[PDB]
């Protein structure tokens with residue numbers, strides 16, 4: 001028993017990280033078969049930042065202008081192209097550590113692991129959620145751009161995020177591996193407010209089920225609620241609406257614990273209205289929203305990766 | 307910026323995990339050069355558990371009784387011995403993925419990453435602390451025994467923990483890689499109370515410095531304190547004494563932030579005496595004690611591993 005904020009094992013992704021330098025800037029790339037993927041602002045300078053002309057900057061770069069290093073072994077670039085906000089650098093050597101992989105675009109409220117990297121070398125791995133406002137609350141310093149976020153299923157790495165920016169509010173923004181931003185953000189220094197963030201209600205419910213599975217049951221009350229009545233309370237506390245799809249996704253945790261989804265919703269309503277009165281749930285004094293239903297089932301069942 | 311509970315990249319350790327079966331039980335082993343290390347209770351049955359005679363159980367086992375699988379490739383066992391609470395299985399094949407490594411015995415309040423494994427395959431990675439009572443608050447299910455905890459420094463994996471038990475209180479206990487338990491625990495089902503746990507005061511101070519580095523400064527008050535006066539308050543709230551060694555270890559974070567260690571101690575004294583009044587620090591509504599001073603400096607400086 002026990003419940004931790006668990007990241008995916010990072011080794012399959014570690015074997016794909018490289019360094020990309022184009023004149024000035026060094027950032028991280030992802031090396032899969034004979035392609036290196038990285039943020040297109042590797043081609044920018046200091047003065048370029050309010051509104052870079054990425055097409056003009058790229059027309060002025062040669063294959064040989066890209067210095068790609070895989071553990072300080074140079075990979076020769078033999079082609080380059082821009083796809084939305086990433087570059088794709090074709091190299092003359094396929095990565096022999098390429099895992100089975102997919103590119104996926106995740107939905108707000110889904111979770112993934114980030115392998116934070118600097119100069120092509122890993123610093124650390126942590127789990128987070130894609131906020132409802134399409135930001136992430138990560139740990140990213142200068143040099144981390146091109147770090148990726150991912151999920152694993154059996155032997156297959158699903159890459160979902162590449163890091164590009166830290167907004168003036170100190171939250172993080174990036175793209176999918178086709179280079180399309182999550183959220184209404186652009187890769188330039190210009191005004192670009194994130195939308196108001198909300199709490200991921202289906203994830204809080206999942207975590208309350210995790211608490212019950214792990215014997216932390218004090219918050220269970222004796223009531224039930226309707227879905228519509230729960231949603232009127234959710235709204236007031238800046239929680240996302242709970243949908244029938246969400247109720248259905250919580251069904252297996254409901255069966256494991258014997259606690260109907262709408263009964264758990266009545267317990268969450270009381271926590272929102274009354275607070276926790278100085279108590280903790282799974283070691284937290286706040287309601288946790290960075291575990292999906294699937295994350296709870298995986299961790300509580302010991303699901304492994306090949 | 308941002309501050310997360312960051313684990314070490316797990317790939318170097320992933321390449322060392324195997325499965326060990328001796329009749330009944332399957333658990334995890336650690337394969338380094340031509341030796342597999344695992345918990346000695348792989349040799350036990352159901353009836354053996356109140357007080358196993360590990361020497362008698364082992365005299366009755368053959369090399370060939372140990373089925374070692376590295377990704378479901380069998381490794382032939384050509385020798386075995388018991389060292390404290392682990393076995394060492396000599397195999398006829400050295401692990402070609404062996405990293406540079408050391409075995410270390412960590413001190414209470416130090417941190418490490420756990421790679422939670424089942425059937426020799428990784429489930430996930432998370433960071434924790436060795437509690438002052440020599441337990442860990444992990445996430446371990448049946449089948450996780452033999453999972454390890456580790457730190458990385460440049461290219462060198464320091465293995466510090468191997469998982470053996472979950473006490474009746476739901477906390478976790480294990481050994482160093484020489485098989486000596488942390489804490490007054492034994493590998494049998496018998497009464498064995500953990501000592502009262504305390505809060506790791508030097509780690510809370512480190513995390514408050516992390517908060518300042520990341521711009522979360524609301525809790526800084528205008529006062530100072532003596533070390534002795536701080537320790538009288540620490541004592542009351544079941545915090546560990548802060549030593550001069552700890553003050554010296556916090557000196558670099560003190561210099562980075564401009565906040566003297568004893569000034570930070572005065573801010574922590576006010577938080578203990580008055581609470582947080584519904585506020586958070588780095589996203590937490592409690593005072594966090596699972597980051598060491600070195601963990602804070604590493605994360606805030608982007609330290610990487612080769």
Ligand SMILES: *[C@](O)(C(N)=O)[C@H](C[C@@H]1CCNC1=O)NC(=O)[C@@H]1[C@@H]2[C@H](CN1C(=O)CCc1ccccc1)C2(C)C
Nearest residue numbers: 041140141142143144145164165166187188189190307
């Ligand atoms: C990334 O380029 C790198 N090399 O690591 C960097 C990461 C970023 C630094 C601080 N923490 C981080 O996550 N990203 C950037 O510096 C990006 C690039 C220009 C500016 N930028 C920002 O993060 C600032 C964004 C901003 C938005 C609105 C107003 C002002 C600034 C790019 C090309 C967006």
Ligand SMILES: *[C@](O)(C(N)=O)[C@H](C[C@@H]1CCNC1=O)NC(=O)[C@@H]1[C@@H]2[C@H](CN1C(=O)CCc1ccccc1)C2(C)C
Nearest residue numbers: 001347446447448449450451470471472493494495496
């Ligand atoms: C480990 O053997 C495994 N195969 O995974 C297992 C891990 C443990 C199961 C539940 N979560 C866990 O972390 N460890 C054990 O089952 C150990 C082995 C016998 C009993 N045991 C316990 O964890 C129970 C400890 C206990 C202490 C006091 C009183 C009653 C029980 C061994 C050999 C200690």
Ligand SMILES: [Ca+2]
Nearest residue numbers: 064065074076
């Ligand atoms: Ca050349």
Ligand SMILES: [Ca+2]
Nearest residue numbers: 370371380382
């Ligand atoms: Ca045989």
